[PDB]
Amino acid sequence: NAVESTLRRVAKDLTGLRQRWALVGGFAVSARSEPRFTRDVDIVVAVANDDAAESLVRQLLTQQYHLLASVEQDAARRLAAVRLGAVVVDLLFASCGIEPEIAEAAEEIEILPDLVAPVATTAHLIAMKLLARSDLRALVDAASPQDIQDARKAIELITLRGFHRDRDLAAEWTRL
């Protein structure tokens, strides 16, 4: 209940600030395949640089959220994600490296009554789950062949940009 309310507000809010965002969590997956909800809202946001990110989060913290975590990294984009409180919202700026592909690529879908929201493509969802690690099994069982192709591409572009941790993701999959 808190979860749908949280999702509604942040969507209101992100749209409000004309951001390029995309659901990549429980609702997203549920939309692209079968019911796999969580008590977390996972969203990607395409933003220019760390200033953009910082600024966005400041603007959101004037609203009715609190900052529960900054996730940082040694690379050119310091600020990978943040986690906010209202139920928790993870915002991903540069966790996977294809945030802006994902957000261009998302499609608007009506998730709840009179809530349309952009939703990561199945292929992207597959990419991201692999990287985080039956959320995945679901997405794959559900995925069309072209879906699988796009996923491989998405995998590749993550690896190129070198957010692949140090993992052969291509590999990790054929296994699973």
Numbering used by the authors: 2 to 87, 95 to 141, 151 to 193
Paper passage:
The Mycobacterium tuberculosis NTase toxin family, MenT, modifies tRNAs to block translation. MenT toxin activity can be stringently regulated by diverse MenA antitoxins. MenT and AbiEii toxins share four highly conserved NTase motifs scattered throughout their structures, proposed to facilitate co-ordination of metals (motifs I and II), base stacking, and transfer of nucleotides to tRNA isoacceptors (motif III), and to contribute to catalysis (motif IV). Our study reveals a conserved mechanism for the control of tuberculosis toxins, and demonstrates how active site auto-phosphorylation can regulate the activity of widespread NTases.
Here we demonstrate through structural, biochemical, biophysical and computational studies that despite lacking kinase motifs, antitoxin MenA1 induces auto-phosphorylation of MenT1 by repositioning the MenT1 phosphoacceptor T39 active site residue towards bound nucleotide. We analysed the MenAT1 co-expression sample by Liquid Chromatography Tandem Mass Spectrometry (LC-MS/MS), which confirmed that T39 is the site of MenT1 phosphorylation. The MenT1-p structure shows clear density for a phosphothreonine (TPO) at position T39. Alignment of each structure via C-alpha atoms only returned an RMSD of 0.410 Å (160 atoms), indicating a near identical topology of core domains and folds. In contrast, aligning the C-alpha atoms of the respective T39 loops returned an RMSD of 0.778 Å (7 atoms), indicating a larger shift between these specific loops. Close-up views revealed further changes caused by the presence of the phosphothreonine, such as steric occlusion of the active site. Structural alignments also revealed that residues R37 and F38 are both ejected from the toxin active site following phosphorylation. However, phosphorylation greatly reduces the net positive charge within the MenT1 active site. Accordingly, when MenT1 and MenT1-p were incubated with E. coli tRNAs from the cell-free PURExpress translation system, we found that MenT1-p was unable to inhibit GFP protein synthesis. When compared against the calculated Rst of this model, the observed Rst of the unknown species almost perfectly matches that of the hypothetical heterodimer, returning an observed/calculated Rst ratio of 0.97. These data suggest that MenT1-p can form a stable heterodimer, but not a heterotrimeric complex.
